[PDB]
Design an enzyme around this catalytic site. Structure first.
Site, PDB file in Angstrom:
ATOM      1  N   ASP A 100       3.229  -0.043  19.202  1.00 32.88           N
ATOM      2  CA  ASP A 100       1.925   0.466  18.796  1.00 32.88           C
ATOM      3  C   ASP A 100       0.835   0.230  19.835  1.00 32.88           C
ATOM      4  OD1 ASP A 100       3.491   0.846  16.616  1.00 32.88           O
ATOM      5  OD2 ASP A 100       2.331  -0.414  15.242  1.00 32.88           O
ATOM      6  N   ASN A 101       0.703  -1.000  20.334  1.00 34.19           N
ATOM      7  CA  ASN A 101      -0.387  -1.304  21.257  1.00 34.19           C
ATOM      8  C   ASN A 101      -0.251  -0.524  22.559  1.00 34.19           C
ATOM      9  OD1 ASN A 101      -0.420  -3.155  19.166  1.00 34.19           O
ATOM     10  ND2 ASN A 101      -1.127  -4.856  20.450  1.00 34.19           N
ATOM     11  N   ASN A 106       3.912  -9.648  10.426  1.00 36.39           N
ATOM     12  CA  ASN A 106       2.910  -8.982  11.249  1.00 36.39           C
ATOM     13  C   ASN A 106       3.043  -9.347  12.723  1.00 36.39           C
ATOM     14  OD1 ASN A 106       1.867  -7.924   8.840  1.00 36.39           O
ATOM     15  ND2 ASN A 106       0.433  -9.634   8.600  1.00 36.39           N
ATOM     16  N   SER A 135      -5.291   2.997  -1.701  1.00 32.60           N
ATOM     17  CA  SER A 135      -4.057   3.425  -1.055  1.00 32.60           C
ATOM     18  C   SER A 135      -3.276   4.427  -1.895  1.00 32.60           C
ATOM     19  CB  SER A 135      -3.175   2.215  -0.747  1.00 32.60           C
ATOM     20  OG  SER A 135      -2.708   1.611  -1.940  1.00 32.60           O
ATOM     21  N   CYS A 144      -1.111   3.575  20.520  1.00 34.48           N
ATOM     22  CA  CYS A 144      -2.544   3.777  20.684  1.00 34.48           C
ATOM     23  C   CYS A 144      -2.879   4.735  21.819  1.00 34.48           C
ATOM     24  CB  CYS A 144      -3.240   2.437  20.926  1.00 34.48           C
ATOM     25  SG  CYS A 144      -3.056   1.246  19.583  1.00 34.48           S
ATOM     26  N   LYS A 171       6.773  -5.152  17.229  1.00 36.75           N
ATOM     27  CA  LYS A 171       5.682  -4.427  16.585  1.00 36.75           C
ATOM     28  C   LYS A 171       4.526  -4.173  17.543  1.00 36.75           C
ATOM     29  CE  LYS A 171       2.547  -4.704  12.604  1.00 36.75           C
ATOM     30  NZ  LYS A 171       2.132  -5.535  11.440  1.00 36.75           N
ATOM     31  N   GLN A 211      10.634  -6.563   7.557  1.00 37.46           N
ATOM     32  CA  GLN A 211      10.555  -7.142   6.220  1.00 37.46           C
ATOM     33  C   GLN A 211      11.935  -7.300   5.594  1.00 37.46           C
ATOM     34  OE1 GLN A 211       7.795  -4.937   3.822  1.00 37.46           O
ATOM     35  NE2 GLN A 211       6.080  -5.234   5.240  1.00 37.46           N
ATOM     36  N   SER A 241       1.543  -1.329  -8.692  1.00 37.71           N
ATOM     37  CA  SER A 241       0.343  -0.959  -7.954  1.00 37.71           C
ATOM     38  C   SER A 241      -0.542  -2.186  -7.791  1.00 37.71           C
ATOM     39  CB  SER A 241      -0.422   0.159  -8.667  1.00 37.71           C
ATOM     40  OG  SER A 241      -0.816  -0.241  -9.968  1.00 37.71           O
ATOM     41  N   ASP A 267       1.422  -7.193  -0.913  1.00 36.68           N
ATOM     42  CA  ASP A 267       0.437  -6.878   0.110  1.00 36.68           C
ATOM     43  C   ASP A 267      -0.934  -7.393  -0.308  1.00 36.68           C
ATOM     44  OD1 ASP A 267      -1.414  -5.642   1.941  1.00 36.68           O
ATOM     45  OD2 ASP A 267       0.094  -4.120   2.384  1.00 36.68           O
ATOM     46  N   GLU A 291       2.575  -8.862   3.759  1.00 31.36           N
ATOM     47  CA  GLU A 291       1.994  -8.183   4.908  1.00 31.36           C
ATOM     48  C   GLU A 291       0.509  -7.945   4.668  1.00 31.36           C
ATOM     49  OE1 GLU A 291       3.789  -4.422   5.676  1.00 31.36           O
ATOM     50  OE2 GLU A 291       2.339  -3.836   7.216  1.00 31.36           O
ATOM     51  N   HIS A 346     -13.021  -0.894  17.543  1.00 27.14           N
ATOM     52  CA  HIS A 346     -12.866  -1.268  16.144  1.00 27.14           C
ATOM     53  C   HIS A 346     -14.093  -0.945  15.305  1.00 27.14           C
ATOM     54  CE1 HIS A 346     -12.073  -4.675  12.984  1.00 27.14           C
ATOM     55  NE2 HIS A 346     -11.822  -3.471  12.504  1.00 27.14           N
ATOM     56  N   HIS A 377      -2.584   8.588  14.548  1.00 26.40           N
ATOM     57  CA  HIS A 377      -1.262   8.128  14.931  1.00 26.40           C
ATOM     58  C   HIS A 377      -0.205   8.711  13.992  1.00 26.40           C
ATOM     59  CE1 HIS A 377      -3.269   5.043  17.444  1.00 26.40           C
ATOM     60  NE2 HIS A 377      -4.119   4.986  16.434  1.00 26.40           N
ATOM     61  N   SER A 423       7.021  -2.026  11.602  1.00 27.00           N
ATOM     62  CA  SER A 423       6.717  -3.201  10.800  1.00 27.00           C
ATOM     63  C   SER A 423       7.532  -3.293   9.521  1.00 27.00           C
ATOM     64  CB  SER A 423       5.225  -3.229  10.438  1.00 27.00           C
ATOM     65  OG  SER A 423       4.861  -2.090   9.678  1.00 27.00           O
ATOM     66  N   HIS A 466       0.837  -1.192   0.000  1.00 27.19           N
ATOM     67  CA  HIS A 466       0.000   0.000   0.000  1.00 27.19           C
ATOM     68  C   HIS A 466       0.875   1.247   0.000  1.00 27.19           C
ATOM     69  CE1 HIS A 466       1.068   0.415   4.212  1.00 27.19           C
ATOM     70  NE2 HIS A 466       0.617  -0.805   4.445  1.00 27.19           N
TER      71      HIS A 466
END
Ligand SMILES: NC(=O)c1ccc[n+]([C@@H]2O[C@H](COP(=O)([O-])OP(=O)(O)OC[C@H]3O[C@@H](n4cnc5c(N)ncnc54)[C@H](O)[C@@H]3O)[C@@H](O)[C@H]2O)c1
Ligand SMILES: NC(=O)c1ccc[n+]([C@@H]2O[C@H](COP(=O)([O-])OP(=O)(O)OC[C@H]3O[C@@H](n4cnc5c(N)ncnc54)[C@H](O)[C@@H]3O)[C@@H](O)[C@H]2O)c1
Ligand SMILES: NC(=O)c1ccc[n+]([C@@H]2O[C@H](COP(=O)([O-])OP(=O)(O)OC[C@H]3O[C@@H](n4cnc5c(N)ncnc54)[C@H](O)[C@@H]3O)[C@@H](O)[C@H]2O)c1
Ligand SMILES: NC(=O)c1ccc[n+]([C@@H]2O[C@H](COP(=O)([O-])OP(=O)(O)OC[C@H]3O[C@@H](n4cnc5c(N)ncnc54)[C@H](O)[C@@H]3O)[C@@H](O)[C@H]2O)c1
Ligand SMILES: Nc1ncnc2c1ncn2[C@@H]1O[C@H](CO)[C@@H](O)[C@H]1O
Lengths: 446, 449, 446, 458
Positions: free
Chosen positions: C175-176, C166, C66, C180, C171, C371, C61, C116, C141, C300, C359, C367, C38
């Site tokens: 973020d968590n 992932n 995205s 967040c 990771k 890779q 693409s 992706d 991903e 969510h 964010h 992330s 993306h």
């Protein structure tokens, strides 16, 4: 009209609670009111019981551009005129020098302004110097810490009692200890739009602003070092969670760059100055920094940080409003990106004036409440209408008593939701305090 | 004997303020020739205090104040040194005043003594009551009790006072250190050494939000508790709201009348432990105990045993002891109790102070600043040279005062250096602009720290 | 576009550190990799750090929404043209597959692929499967695409090793726990925009984002309550100094009005929902709440609170853009001000519409770094040399190994300024871990 | 059968035990469910874990639930005096008292194995630290024929047990209860956050506010220790070898330093960075490795610093070097004073000396009572649930061909952990919501079944 008033209305718990508690036996049955202090949307509610006052008001506006253009749209009740003027596009002398001081302020009492600065104090009251022993109006309740005491009243013949409503307990605590704590949380918030976790920052001074600005950074997750010149505040810094260090070497700043510790200076990227001195960060610590530093001046006035030397030797290039890229060693190049530049976290002045325009009206809730309530600590007895033998017995200038602040705090306590216990008669006399208060003397610091 | 000095020497390194006085004025000895009579309790810390006093050239004589408060083995060192001490408990308690009398009176004639360093004692019942004329040589008295200064001021207004005295309880370095901090350090230790409970997830009730109240609130929250604040002063109760706590009262609409229908049973049914941080009487009566959740803990950090009710408990509820810190009190009756029953309470000490009943309190470093101001008072008094001034000025200077702010900052300066910090020194140009000299105090008298 | 690169490259310590470290070894000498993720700003730096090690990279693409038009300015410097789309141009997806895979009318070979969406992998065997038996591995991903990949692996089809980027300890933590905990403060600042120290709030859910949400509110002076269905999460909530409550009596939702604890709901000034479940805040408990309460959702789905009940049975209004006034009078009929009304913040929806800035761009760094190591690890083995019998063992899909995660975290610690101790040979054998390999087993939860 | 200084000390234990049971719901709650069934009839557990007042209730519930056990202490300074007498007063043969030497420690671990001079038959083993597992795994390989279960408690022990299986010497199936969430993230995370600062203050009485400390290792123990030191006002620093734990340490708001410059340790005096180590008054070891504080670091420290250790073994800090080179003096029990001037030349007024806590052993057990009661609830419940599960199999009587599948290490399923967590939350005063039938079709799990996948780490 009143829809503007509804916006806050009950948002000020103290004044509304006073309205809902003093709606019975109405005090202040005498003089009319005019008003001069700045007419913000919030301000025009201090009338409380408009029926116990002039109810025409007209908001005399003796100080500079007190009235606002919203007056014509808002103040439209029965029999209350307003000028709705702002700025000085037209001549202001016609309504200031030739003010309604004699027109509306007729010399037959029944007129109050409750303003800041007391209009013209001695000369003001000496135009009709017969109100003495006949207190039926304003009695010099003007706030105005700049006015302070004005010895001219004491050494002079103006002996009208005055109890200024500034310098109380809840006024200062609500502003610095708590409440308006968003001072640093206007840069350290989105203002730098960066995460502060794991970094090292330096804050100079440990006053009330310094104390309020050191818990927020630690709660964020930052590493903070404190400097101080007074042993008491330095001890308070050491006792909470912070180490006390000084920018200068060995504790003495005398002559040059040989008298600064270059180890701790080269590992800090955020500087907060909670001081009101002259050179708290001169052009000697900016010479040693971690190749990248942000500077925000939270202290009073703008004489701190550097002097008229940083403007010329270091270029103050701007790439974002209220943000700069002041270089350190970027000679020539025209890029200044090789880690030789400093960010200006503010414009170089107070963030509340440059980075902020509007302010909450909650800070004045405890300011207007006691100012309105002082008229009934006055009025009441009105010992002016007494023989002059007893007049000189109790002539002094005192700040507002403890009860007039405890009652104001009581309304705020129950505004959030809470109950305060009531002292039983046995417990009141054991300590040596009446049931209704006050509970502490004037030397207590809280 | 020798063991006492071994105990002393390790604790000596934890007091930068007292030790720094022996070398900041090394060789000058401003306290030359001063004779001091004192009655401060004989402890390890007071041993460091007196050793600091002697090092400046003056000599002191000390005795006991409460008799009950003693260390026994600490008196062996002083006895070996030579200064008489009566820290040992009297068999018939007749030594409480007999020993204090012995130190004051020597032979049969008066002797030259100019200073007194007392701790809330009854010397006014001996010195000012039996021979007030002896005060023609003593220049000043040092006291630290917060209630003592009011008594002295009342006596000064009555005119019976003979010699001026200075109190130290109103200093910042005393009020801030000895009340707010210390209780923050010692409350958790007091709770855990007797209960060993997991304070996280519990709920607590705190009565009062004064000097000890703020430290008590910060001590329980840092462990992860839920704290509620009850207060009678709106200004103090206002500070609880801005500190994250919620304000509640154990009575319906804040009105107490002695009937059981005035107790809020919903709130009191969720509290785990209760502490009292006031100086009043019956801030937690027998009605609040009825609505408390079963198996609760009771604490007291006030002044006396009358703050929270214990006379009712000893007449109606059972008692049981294991160790002299934690007691079992059953909410059924005094007839008897079962070893497995749930209806019981846990009381920390017998309702007195918990810091003394669990640990040493402020162990060595907070008490350093408290004892440093008392010594700095004697130097100021001896510098005034009362003897040189004529008798006409004696009536002018008879007053009650507190330590000047300049003498208070030096006590704080030594504490900062004990943590390894450094204090900046103002340049001459910067000091005169702010309105304060380089050495003079930087804030007015009415400032609230 | 150059300015955006400089700030982006300076806000991603991991990728830049890898670029400045692994340079000089070139572990991508014989790699033929075609990629499409993306289109974001961090994708450019991902391409740069992949090609800096010598990889032959081809970009295309593969997602419709995205793509952005503003990226064309930055690609103008690059010699490789790109294509972007505005909306759902599904009919044009056939053009992208045909043109990008078939270069000059002849089939092309790729040693390893990284895309992706987890959908383009089937295209490889569908169009040109002849060279798809000579591909070292696949790293994609996507969310829930690994399920399709394992399903096809059990069904055969595409014969190629796979590894996902992932699931990682690094990771999750960035973020968590610390990524967040950014929207809640911003959301409440936008909504209330005033001090809220002393009031009460209810937070629903304590799994992973509830911890950050509940920790952020307490340090501002609030009393926070947490409700939860998972006993372990409730236990973790209790140990942190919170309270566990249930809106329904005894926790049983009978659907009637007689099984709601209105005593607690009558003292709650804020509702925060974090859990991705249905009817976690029913209309029955939304009618027993106190006046002027504020509801918000950071979960969510947009159907957690019982929405549209206030849309049909009650009335709406318009306030500050992302604030809605809902009046409890019912359908219609109200006075000028009244007292029964609630306040919405995002009607249960996301804040990506403009309510909050969201964010920061640092999220994709945590992330994208993994890779590169996923490509490097899945390249060292000689696929062409391994026999068919041993390829049965190699025909499996595994998560990123523990070794590659530690190399990612090592760069982050040095970025803030720090040093990591190195084991001695005597100590390494005492643990059973090589001095440069994984330090923790796969069952360690950190 | 018992050996105690005075029988009067058991009275304190029971009163604390009743309080402990009143604050240990999950163990007592599950006790009533299985009291009327007796599902583990005939079990045989040999126990060696820290005999705290928390530990005694486990022995009590095992013996009153229909099982016979024998227990012994785990360390020199591990067993509380009142807890040991309470278990002894119940009739269970135990060996614990006040004051033990290193040679006496090995006598007690093997005394539980033996029975009046002859071997004692056993079925299951409850071992902490791996001492009891290995001592009989080699000296008496015969007992493993009848024994068919081992339950471990600590992190270090499972490493020693796992090493046996790879070598092929392991013969008995084991249950790894240390991997359950209600033990890994409950016992050794929060227990230290409550016990470390209590242990430090009770020995030195120092005012922690404003001082500086160094903590080595940021695992599960490191996090709790760091929070415990930080909430009192100290300025703490963390050293770590694992980059992920270092990342977590930096994110919380600490600082990462290495005592050896550039992290390279090679034994020379130039490796040690003396400047940083000259401003530290406290050092704590959490790694559990060997020789984390060497001679080149211990003698180059700031004067009058405090040394303490929470790791399982005594190899964290080199107490052997300082023992025969520097004089040792005792200031009080469990706290020592060491002058580093010379081997035997010292005076009471020396300015150079270090203070040692617990002589390098576990500080929270030497100078403190240890973890609280409600933290140990989440471990003993899993221990009981694992013991009942494996005893019924009777692996000693299984077919030889089947043993190839039944000789491994297993863990308890997640449902048991959920039940324990619910029973422990219900005692704090909380109410847990119950899912309506519509919820199951959306969340993906049943009403009573599990709630999270096995890859979830909480
Ligand atoms: N937040 C607001 O709205 C607001 C408004 C006006 C003023 N203020 C500031 O609030 C503060 C509270 O006043 P205060 O009396 O507690 O502190 P202060 O006015 O004395 O501020 C300076 C602090 O730093 C120390 N200091 C003084 N000179 C210094 C120097 N050269 N270098 C380093 N440290 C130095 C002082 O001891 C003091 O602690 C003041 O600094 C004042 O400027 C805040
Ligand atoms: N144990 C210790 O370590 C220690 C230390 C210092 C002082 N003390 C003693 O303990 C007491 C604590 O002193 P302090 O500094 O807190 O005093 P303080 O005057 O600062 O505060 C006492 C508070 O009690 C409140 N209060 C009184 N009656 C109340 C009632 N019925 N309900 C609710 N609030 C009520 C008052 O409003 C006041 O805020 C004093 O007697 C002091 O001598 C003990
Ligand atoms: N920034 C964001 O907004 C963001 C970021 C990541 C994920 N999410 C989304 O958040 C959703 C929730 O997952 P998460 O990441 O918050 O972590 P999570 O999955 O661990 O949280 C879910 C929690 O809700 C609880 N729960 C479920 N039903 C409940 C009920 N009826 N009552 C009370 N509690 C209940 C569960 O016990 C669990 O603890 C996911 O679907 C995810 O896509 C949002
Ligand atoms: N109450 C107690 O005393 C108690 C409780 C539980 C566990 N323990 C003990 O704690 C120890 C470890 O506990 P854990 O489960 O947190 O372990 P852990 O494996 O989860 O973490 C220990 C940490 O030590 C670090 N480490 C190892 N060698 C290192 C080195 N040379 N330099 C720097 N860091 C190094 C590792 O990186 C790891 O992060 C075990 O020995 C266990 O027995 C003691
Ligand atoms: N009070 C206690 N009783 C028994 N074991 C404990 C106690 N506190 C900690 N432990 C355990 O001791 C082991 C290492 O000391 C760890 O497995 C830890 O869980």
């Amino acid at each position: 009209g009143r829809r503007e008033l509804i916006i806050a209305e009950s948002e000020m718990p103290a004044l509304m609670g006073l309205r809902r508690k003093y709606a019975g036996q109405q005090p202040l049955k005498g003089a009319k009111i005019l008003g001069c202090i700045h007419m913000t949307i919030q301000t025009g509610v201090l009338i409380e019981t408009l029926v116990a006052l002039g109810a025409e008001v007209r908001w005399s506006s003796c100080n500079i551009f007190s009235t606002q253009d919203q007056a014509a749209a808002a103040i439209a009740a029965a029999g209350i005129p307003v000028f709705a003027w702002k700025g000085e596009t037209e001549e202001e002398y016609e309504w200031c020098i030739e003010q309604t001081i004699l027109k509306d302020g007729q010399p037959w009492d029944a007129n109050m302004v409750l303003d800041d600065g007391g209009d013209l104090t001695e000369i003001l009251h000496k135009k009709y110097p017969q109100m003495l022993e006949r207190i039926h109006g304003i009695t010099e309740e003007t706030t105005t810490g700049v006015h302070r005491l004005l010895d001219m009243l004491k050494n002079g013949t103006l002996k009208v009692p005055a109890i200024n409503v500034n310098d109380s307990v809840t006024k200062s605590k609500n502003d610095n200890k708590y409440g308006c704590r968003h001072s640093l949380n206007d840069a350290i918030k989105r203002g730098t739009d960066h995460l502060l976790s794991g970094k090292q920052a330096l804050v100079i001074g440990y006053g009330d602003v310094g104390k309020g600005s050191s818990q927020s950074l630690r709660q964020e997750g930052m590493i903070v070092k404190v400097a101080e010149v007074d042993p008491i505040c330095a001890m308070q810094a050491c006792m909470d969670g912070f180490e006390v260090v000084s920018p200068y070497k060995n504790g003495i700043n005398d002559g040059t760059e040989a008298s600064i510790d270059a180890a701790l200076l080269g590992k800090i990227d955020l500087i907060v100055t909670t001081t009101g001195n002259v050179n708290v960060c001169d052009a000697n610590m900016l010479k040693a920094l971690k190749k990248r530093a942000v500077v925000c001046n939270i202290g009073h006035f703008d004489n701190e940080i550097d002097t008229a030397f940083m403007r010329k030797n270091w270029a103050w290039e701007e790439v974002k409003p209220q943000v700069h890229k002041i270089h350190r060693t970027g000679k020539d190049g025209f890029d200044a990106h090789n880690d030789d530049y400093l960010i200006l976290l503010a414009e170089g002045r107070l963030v509340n004036l440059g980075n902020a325009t509007g302010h909450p009206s909650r800070i004045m809730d405890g300011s207007f409440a006691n100012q309105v309530l002082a008229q009934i600590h006055l009025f009441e007895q009105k010992y002016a209408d007494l023989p002059a033998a007893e007049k000189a017995k109790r002539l002094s200038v005192e700040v507002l008593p403890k009860k007039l602040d405890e009652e104001v705090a009581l309304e705020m306590v129950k505004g959030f939701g809470g109950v305060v216990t009531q002292l039983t008669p046995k417990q009141a006399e054991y300590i040596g305090v009446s049931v209704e208060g006050p509970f502490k003397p004037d030397t207590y610091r809280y």
